Design a protein around this ligand. Structure first.
Ligand SMILES: *[C@@H]1O[C@H](CO)[C@@H](O[C@@H]2O[C@H](CO)[C@@H](O)[C@H](O)[C@H]2NC(C)=O)[C@H](O)[C@H]1NC(C)=O
Ligand SMILES: *[C@@H]1O[C@H](CO)[C@@H](O[C@@H]2O[C@H](CO)[C@@H](O)[C@H](O)[C@H]2NC(C)=O)[C@H](O)[C@H]1NC(C)=O
Ligand SMILES: [Ca+2]
Ligand SMILES: [Ca+2]
Ligand code: NI
Ligand code: NI
Lengths: 380, 191, 380, 191
């Protein structure tokens, strides 16, 4: 049994609301309002985030009727409007993804639509109609949080709805009607981290993977990490059909990183994983070269440029076919399929081929992995 | 079993008061729309607010629905036994019931009116007042002075004044289990 | 130096407001409202008390113009109205002086005046006009708490304004404008006891006195007490002109009560003052008899019915003139003026001549003495 | 010395915003009435609220007065330097000053109007907008499309359209240090 040699402050916040709980982009909350008389829409809440892109809330009727969406794009507030076919999108205000709490609110003051950050206005858009719609002697209006009722492809300007942000002190159309605050108390999985530092956090229970092309052929991985366990798969390539692990970087003990192709190593390097410090593991591969650096300090290989070739030759042959790129772990493979196979537990940001991996952009992110927020290292 | 987990409570108060009833069920996949039943009938036009929270990873796993009916200006008709209703397939489900009743201070229907009568001539003043709760005891006042020991005692709903040799004034308290509500002060002008 | 052998929970409550702070019946707070447009009066607050009589708040204009006063009389809510000469007074609702917190509020809903206890109405009085009055293109209204702007003799039905009650969670005409809550933080003297038990509390720093007549002649004192010091004057009579202490009951050590006339004792009785329990000291005097009981158990005199007469003879001669009745202490007299002269520190209720002494009715109560509330005995 | 202990702060915000200034002095016996000065002049008609708290045992000992001026719908004129004033005898006392300034998104004065023009005929639309703060950069849109790289660039206050062979629509954003306020969408109908 492996244990956390460097635990983190896994302290939630019962009074909050996690908008990134579900990778499927389903709204974490859906409200449906039926009101007797005309009603002005007013939503307000405290919000904290690092994720530069995401959906805060949807409010309105049917996908192609009339609605509004308040979102985060480029770390700034974006507002999309559809008042019957007529699309529209606006963006302004300050930076929101600064990690500090703040107050955001949308409302139908006058015949405009006003958006405020910290009780101060940033956007005033003119609209011609009301969000609440008359249907059978009653006015209705739906409101979803952290996601929308339909497919992003039908928005006005598509966007990856997945938003790893926290929310609290909410008030939907005036009322404290503690109904949400109640279930969120019972479901820790819905609360956020009390304190959030930058990066992506893996709790060591799942993985995420992408369909990346590596075709000559390159393979550059840069993994800023902050382990919480002595062993665990950082980066890795997987061949589905033959359940093979073409390439893989990981941690093991004593105490060191390890580049490898299938069941055989290729280079090692010692690291003090249990000092809660940010290390910069970096691997560079292509026919002829196969180096592994840790904070700018290569390690001695385990091959011989002779064996190293009866490997890179296999690797580049694997890349001639579909290959899933895994982060943090590997599907169910036999223990002898690679040097390490257990899940990584800690903070880790990956750069794969000069590109930065956005866990919201993956093909599949295990749910307990936080896309853009890591808990702090509990100082003992 | 019954999808419900939380049943309506009870709200009693004076006319005008706004309050809310709420039931909360838990279902499997895509939650049903929850309706409100009052006295066994369907409430077609009423302010309600449903809160849906997905417990699973998809929209086909367990959900938590909570619906709250809101009564704005509580009047008399809004009084009754209320309950939640959800359709799960061709089947039907109802929540335990909750009851909402009107109950506050006396409400006047008639209050002493202002008059101008000839001296030493007889006349009458009136003072009706409804509940609930009932019964409501009346009690007059002359120039800020009770005309009886306590409520319910003395004239009520109709006070006969034999005569007045000078302008005077009458009030009319109205009491009931909730408390008391005094009427306006009528001024009788003498000539 | 004497020390508290039985300390009490002298724990204040920074978030509260003491209405009985000043014996002079001056309001503890005075608000003056100048408003641009017509304004509905609305006051609400949480209130706790044992005192059966007192003034909660005054609201309105000039003494003989139009105003309202919400008060406590007979432990119930009383409302007095003057809308230009036309007096009026109403009373109803539940008991208020039960020692538990509650919510009271006055407001000008409709053309009536509504009073509520725990968000539920108890009194609805019809009025013909508004409390805010138009003066120089502006509407004005004064509001005083725990007292009135004028003399009780000018009310509508006089009442002893002195009210020993606590207030918190207030809101005057809508606003949290933490202005009061601020100074009350800096001035402990304005906060109340966190927990309040029944009785009157003497902190041992002052006294209270009345002008009571004792003319034959009687002198019956019944003092339910709960000491916090081994020594201290419970009851006492004082002759101003000659600074004499005609009669006096007190505590001394060992550890016992002591009836006395001027410098000479007359009877003693042991008591376990330091067990924080309620004792019932009782003294009965008149020519011929002079007994002292403690929980229904007399003590042996120090006289001889011969000396006891060359005392009661002096006493009854003292009563032939003006005599101030002191509770808890004595003015500055020479130490040899009586057996005990230091102030009593603890809870104590006095019955003087079949009559109950109301510290609010005294001619002078030192300010740190709480008329109808004692702090609890801190269990150690 | 000066009776004051607390001086006014500062309140800046958009038109409409309600806010409050407040100074708090401490005096000896029966507190004075505190007035408000704006730009050195006396504010005769303004919402204010004085809170007096006696520190002594009588009304002749030390008092704590706190006066707060409240500005309801903050408009332009309410802008200035504000300060408290109390008269202590024939003498006079003023508080440190506080300043209240208007500052929010752009305010339109003229917005693109709806029109119905003959095909391939020229016409013009207008779009004025004031601050503060200034300067405010304009930016047109055609059928939801910018007609320039960024605000301030391109036509402004007056856009000339050479002609339209089909009904189209124009908007007009207005930007300034605070943020942006988009105008209504004008629809030009072609014949
Ligand atoms: C608000 O959202 C609800 C979804 O919860 C919509 O309800 C659906 O409406 C369609 C068409 O009316 C039905 O076919 C579905 O079966 C409904 N689902 C449920 C659970 O009732 C509703 O239409 C939306 N209303 C608005 C504001 O347009
Ligand atoms: C509100 O209370 C104030 C405070 O006492 C009253 O002001 C006094 O009014 C009298 C008569 O106009 C003046 O002679 C005094 O000089 C005032 N004192 C102060 C401190 O200004 C005022 O009368 C009350 N307002 C009303 C109409 O009830
Ligand atoms: Ca995102
Ligand atoms: Ca009293
Ligand atoms: Ni069917
Ligand atoms: Ni003068």
């Amino acid at each position: 049994d492996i244990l956390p040699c460097v635990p983190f402050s896994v302290a939630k916040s019962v009074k909050s609301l996690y908008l990134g709980r579900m990778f499927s982009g389903t709204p974490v909350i859906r409200l449906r309002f039926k009101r007797l008389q005309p009603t002005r829409l007013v939503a307000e809440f405290d919000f904290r985030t690092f994720d530069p892109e995401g959906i805060l809330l949807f409010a309105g009727g049917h996908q192609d009727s009339t609605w509004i969406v308040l979102a985060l794009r480029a770390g700034r507030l974006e507002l999309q409007l559809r008042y019957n076919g007529v699309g529209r999108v606006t963006s302004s205000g300050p930076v929101i993804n600064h990690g500090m709490w703040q107050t955001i609110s949308v409302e139908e003051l006058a015949r405009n639509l006003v958006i405020k950050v910290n009780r101060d206005a940033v956007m005033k858009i003119a609209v011609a109609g009301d969000l609440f719609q008359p249907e059978r002697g009653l006015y209705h209006l739906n409101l979803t949080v952290g996601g929308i009722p339909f497919h992003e492809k039908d928005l006005v300007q598509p966007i990856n709805p997945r938003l790893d942000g926290c929310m609290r002190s909410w008030n939907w159309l005036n009322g404290e009607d503690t109904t949400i605050q109640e279930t969120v108390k019972v479901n820790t999985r819905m609360q956020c981290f009390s304190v959030t530092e930058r990066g992506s956090f893996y709790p060591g229970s799942g993985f995420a993977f992408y369909s990346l092309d590596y075709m000559t052929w390159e393979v550059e991985v840069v993994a800023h990490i902050r382990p919480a366990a002595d062993t665990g798969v950082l980066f890795a390539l997987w061949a589905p059909d033959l359940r093979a692990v073409p390439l893989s970087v990981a941690l093991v003990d004593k105490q060191l990183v390890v580049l490898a192709v299938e069941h055989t190593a290729l280079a090692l390097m010692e690291i003090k994983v249990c000092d809660g410090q940010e290390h910069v593991v970096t691997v560079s591969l292509r026919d002829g070269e196969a180096t592994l650096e840790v904070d700018g300090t290569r390690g001695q290989s385990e091959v011989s440029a002779a064996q190293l070739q009866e490997r890179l030759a296999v690797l580049e042959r694997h890349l001639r076919s579909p290959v899933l790129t895994f982060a943090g772990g590997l599907p169910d493979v036999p223990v002898t399929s690679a040097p390490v196979t257990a899940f990584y537990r800690g903070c880790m940001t990956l750069e794969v081929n000069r590109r930065l991996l956005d866990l919201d952009e993956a093909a599949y992110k295990h749910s307990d992995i936080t896309a853009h927020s890591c808990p702090p290292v509990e100082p003992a | 079993e019954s999808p419900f987990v939380g049943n309506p409570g009870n709200i009693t108060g004076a006319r005008g008061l706004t309050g809310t009833l709420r039931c909360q069920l838990q279902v499997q996949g895509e939650p049903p729309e929850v309706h409100w039943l009052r006295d066994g009938q369907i409430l077609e036009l009423a302010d309600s607010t449903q809160t849906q929270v997905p417990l699973g990873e998809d929209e086909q796993d367990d959900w938590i629905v909570v619906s709250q009916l809101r009564i704005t200006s509580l009047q008399l008709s809004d009084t009754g036994q209320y309950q939640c209703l959800v359709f799960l397939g061709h089947q039907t489900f109802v929540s335990q019931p909750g009851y909402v009743g009107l109950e506050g201070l006396p409400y006047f229907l008639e209050e002493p009116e202002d008059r101008t009568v000839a001296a030493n001539t007889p006349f009458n003043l009136s003072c009706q007042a409804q509940g609930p709760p009932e019964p409501v005891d009346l009690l007059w006042l002359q120039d800020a002075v009770p005309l009886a020991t306590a409520p319910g005692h003395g004239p009520q709903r109709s006070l006969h004044v034999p005569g007045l040799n000078k302008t005077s004034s009458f009030s009319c308290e109205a009491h009931n289990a909730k408390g008391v509500t005094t009427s306006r002060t009528a001024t009788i002008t003498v000539l």
